[PDB]
């Protein structure tokens, strides 16, 4: 289900990219926020039998703290009807995704 949360994050980044209007952007980011907070609660396959306080487990969860804060900054823009500003903000989300997607 952790895998499917990543894919929801990945899928909605494509929708934001192609989006015509603020509604399409807003709906995508809201789903992304939920997928990221659910993912946080999970444990990736390599770290299954690690400590919940392991430096790798904190970092794994930390990746989603960064993502949520970025989704929040873009949600503020999208809530003001600012499509291009939000799409540029969503651009910085990809950089966070790529840095954490397969690190674990």
């Amino acid at each position: 289900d952790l895998e499917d949360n990543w894919e929801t994050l990945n899928d909605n980044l494509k929708v934001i990219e192609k989006a015509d209007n603020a509604a399409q952007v807003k709906d995508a980011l809201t789903k992304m926020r939920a997928a990221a907070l659910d993912a946080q609660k999970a444990t990736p396959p390599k770290l299954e039998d690690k400590s919940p306080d392991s430096p790798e487990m904190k970092d794994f969860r930390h990746g989603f703290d960064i993502l949520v804060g970025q989704i929040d900054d873009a949600l503020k823009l999208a809530n003001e009807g600012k499509v291009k500003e939000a799409q540029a903000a969503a651009e910085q989300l990809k950089t966070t995704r790529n840095a954490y997607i397969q690190k674990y």
């Epitope: 929040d72 540029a88 910085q92 950089t95």
Partner: antibody, heavy 119, light 108 residues
């Protein structure tokens, strides 16, 4: 009319702190990510971190997470970078910059701030 | 952290000649790779974004190509005003990283 305007050169003593300013104008300051960069003469640039001035949310290069602290005064549309515990290794040109986007024609750079850390 | 290797460190050319500047990533950065010119210590000038997308106003002699790890900035017919430093930057993943630069200089 889109500019980033940094404070003038800084001469600072080892151990002291400094605050470099980045004044945005000609666009809505709170709506765009601001990156900070470090460059020694003729050398490759290093990324320090970004701040989203709308929220004050920040992300740091691990290398600078104990050296630099990014803040904004959203009233004056000014980004600030605080450098602490300064040594001669912090002597450099610092740039604030709106990064390249698929969605905007251009990126934008401050003129740069030269920091000399010397006794 | 992703390492960007720029070869060679120095490129000697005559005005009018073709030239190719190499930037190799130590892991995949897709097309998230940008090219800058810097004459002195002044702010870098974006030439190419997303590997091969030219910037509004950049003269036709500049083009970029590549995706994944191997990138090339090409100057069709070098101008005197092209002599100076060239940097590549990846925005694939944190931290943002740059090459150490290639210097384009007059040959003799």
């Amino acid at each position: 009319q889109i500019q980033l305007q940094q404070s003038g050169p800084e001469l600072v003593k080892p151990g002291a702190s400094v605050k470099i300013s980045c004044k945005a104008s000609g666009y809505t300051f709170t709506d765009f990510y601001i990156n900070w960069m470090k460059q020694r003469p003729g050398q490759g640039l290093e990324w320090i971190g970004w701040i989203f001035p709308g929220s004050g949310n920040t992300h740091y290069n691990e290398k600078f997470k104990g050296k630099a602290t990014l803040i904004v005064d959203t009233s004056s549309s000014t980004a600030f970078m605080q450098l602490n515990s300064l040594t001669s290794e912090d002597s450099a040109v610092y740039f604030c910059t709106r990064p390249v986007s698929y969605y905007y024609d251009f990126d934008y750079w401050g003129q740069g701030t030269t920091l000399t850390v010397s006794s | 952290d992703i390492v960007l290797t720029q070869s060679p460190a120095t490129l000697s050319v005559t005005p009018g000649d073709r030239v190719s500047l190499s930037c190799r990533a130590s892991q995949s950065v897709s097309n998230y790779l940008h090219w800058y010119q810097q004459k002195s210590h002044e702010s870098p000038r974006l030439l190419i974004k997303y590997a091969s997308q030219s910037i509004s106003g950049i003269p036709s002699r500049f083009s970029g190509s590549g995706s994944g790890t191997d990138f090339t900035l090409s100057i069709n017919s070098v101008e005197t005003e092209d002599f100076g430093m060239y940097f590549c930057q990846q925005s694939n993943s944190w931290p943002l990283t740059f090459g150490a630069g290639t210097k384009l200089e007059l040959r003799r």
